[PDB]
DNA sequence: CACGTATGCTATAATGTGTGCAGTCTGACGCGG
DNA sequence: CCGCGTCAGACTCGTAGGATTATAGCATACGTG
RNA sequence: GAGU
């Protein structure tokens, strides 16, 4: 919107290419992470954690 | 009486006489000449062949009637391109056209999202290959195992298998229980809530108030150039031409007005900074 | 020209469907023979 | 009359995600960077 | 599977 054009011109803060779809703890449940499992396809570079 | 579409159609086809070779040749000479009647009689005499073939190709592609009509279209191509002089029988030639037309129809119409023939046929070779692999591996093959067999990229195989992913109905009720469908759960993500809508009101209105804090000249330059209080985002030349010739002076007043807003923000920005989430 | 999407022809003879389920509820109120 | 058909059949809560098949093989044709 |  023209307002955000003006505002992002003022502050610079040009919005980046990546968003955010991170898995987070569902609200009001709280606990301890006891295990993690990783599944990767045959060809994609594995994570350090994997 | 008898109200089935299919039964009625099959009865009608039944009441047309089957042709011999010499008859087909005689008829067909006149049909290439453009006899009209000859073409009609050859078509109608050979409809039963179409139904025999559509019977086979049916199964799960489409409705039997649908297959029959497309098959008829193939048979018509065959009657138009038949060669009576060549000793080969008509039924032999027609079979090719009928199967062809039916197959091509079921490659297009069957899929809700229309898949082009090249993609479909590629995908089919991936499938047949998967079947051979699965026989010998005992197991259904991975994407990379199929790719290793074809000596091709895994990304190619993957993209094709993604296209094969068939659709689910939004109306299908969930959990073997006629309780509620997918539609009942599935939100409109584009439509934000009353929260987001009210935040835009608040935002836009705070910007009006902030624009009025500045000079009459700065505020008007900003309004016209941003397209905020104006209609169109007037370029430097447009704003200058309406006010002060100097196109460069528009840039100067504009940048000056932005810096006065930054001052208001460092002073009272304690509200503005919280607009960052 | 290439890349993506389409239309096309192949020549032993072959010429009327079936298929996969449905399981049958109940008391009431109208509508052609 | 008999028979065949159509129309209805309580209200909120829950759980969990998910599945099938197969369409040849090759040459020409149309539209965009 | 939960009260009705």
From Swiss-Prot, chain A:
Protein name: DNA-directed RNA polymerase subunit beta
Subunit-structure text: The RNAP catalytic core consists of 2 alpha, 1 beta, 1 beta' and 1 omega subunit. When a sigma factor is associated with the core the holoenzyme is formed, which can initiate transcription. The rRNA transcription and antitermination complex (rrnTAC) consists of RNAP, NusA, NusB, NusE (rpsJ), NusG, SubB, ribosomal protein S4, DNA and precursor rRNA; S4 is more flexible than other subunits. In pull-down experiments interacts with CedA. (Microbial infection) Interacts (via flap domain) with Escherichia phage lambda antitermination protein Q; this interaction renders bacterial RNAP resistant to transcription pausing and allows it to read through termination signals.
Protein family (similarity comment): Belongs to the RNA polymerase beta chain family.
Lineage: Bacteria, Pseudomonadati, Pseudomonadota, Gammaproteobacteria, Enterobacterales
Post-translational modification summary for this protein: Acetylated on several lysine residues in the presence of glucose.
Full-protein positions shown: 896 to 945 of 1342
Statement on biotechnological application from the UniProt entry: Co-administration of salinamide and rifampicin or salinamide and myxopyronin suppresses the emergence of resistance to both antibiotics.
Task of the protein: DNA-dependent RNA polymerase (RNAP) catalyzes the transcription of DNA into RNA using the four ribonucleoside triphosphates as substrates.
UniProtKB/Swiss-Prot annotation, chain B:
Factors inducing expression: Subject to complex regulation at multiple levels (transcription, translation, regulation of activity and degradation). Transcription is induced during entry into stationary phase and in response to different stresses. Transcription is repressed by antitoxin MqsA. mRNA stability is regulated by small RNA regulators and various proteins such as Hfq, CsdA, CspC and CspE. Finally, the cellular level of RpoS is regulated by proteolysis via RssB and the ClpXP protease.
Section of the entire sequence shown: 53 to 329 of 330
Segments for region (Sigma-70 factor domain-3): 122-197
Region Sigma-70 factor domain-1, residue ranges: 4-37
Outcome, altering residue 121 to E: Eliminates RpoS proteolysis. Lack of interaction with RssB
Protein's organism: Escherichia coli (strain K12)
Consequence of gene disruption: Stationary phase cells lose resistance to killing by endoribonuclease MazF.
Protein name: RNA polymerase sigma factor RpoS
Keyword entries, A-Z: Cytoplasm, DNA-binding, Sigma factor, Stress response, Transcription, Transcription regulation
Keyword Metal-binding: no
Subunit structure: Interacts with the RNA polymerase core enzyme and RssB.
């Amino acid at each position: 919107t023209p307002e955000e054009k003006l505002l992002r011109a003022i502050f610079g803060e040009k919005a980046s290419d990546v968003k955010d779809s991170s898995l987070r703890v569902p609200n009001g449940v709280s606990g301890t992470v006891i295990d993690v499992q990783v599944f990767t396809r045959d060809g994609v570079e594995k994570d350090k954690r994997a | 009486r008898v109200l089935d579409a299919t039964q009625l159609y099959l009865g009608e086809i039944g009441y047309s006489p089957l042709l011999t070779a010499e008859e087909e040749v005689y008829f067909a000479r006149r049909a290439l000449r453009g006899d009209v009647a000859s073409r009609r009689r050859m078509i109608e005499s050979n409809l039963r062949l179409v139904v025999k073939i559509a019977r086979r190709y049916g199964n799960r592609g489409l409705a039997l009637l649908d297959l029959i009509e497309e098959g008829n279209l193939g048979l018509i191509r065959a009657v138009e391109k038949f060669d009576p002089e060549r000793g080969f029988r008509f039924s032999t030639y027609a079979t090719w056209w009928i199967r062809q037309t039916i197959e091509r129809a079921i490659m297009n119409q069957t899929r809700t999202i229309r898949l082009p023939i090249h993609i479909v046929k590629e995908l089919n070779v991936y499938l047949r290959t998967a079947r051979e692999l699965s026989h010998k591996l005992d197991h259904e093959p991975s994407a990379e195992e199929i790719a290793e067999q074809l000596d091709k990229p895994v990304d190619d195989v993957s993209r094709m298998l993604r296209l094969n992913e068939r659709i689910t109905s939004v109306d299908t009720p969930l959990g073997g229980d006629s309780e509620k469908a997918l539609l009942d759960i599935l939100a409109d993500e584009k439509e934000n809530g009353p929260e987001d809508t009210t935040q835009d009101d608040d935002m836009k209105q705070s910007i009006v108030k902030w624009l009025f804090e500045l000079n009459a000249k700065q505020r008007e330059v900003l309004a016209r150039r941003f397209g905020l209080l104006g209609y169109e985002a007037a370029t430097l030349e447009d704003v200058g031409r309406e006010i002060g010739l100097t196109r460069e002076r528009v840039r100067q007043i504009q940048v000056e007005g932005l810096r006065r807003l930054r001052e208001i923000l460092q002073t009272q920005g304690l509200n503005i900074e919280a607009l960052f989430l």
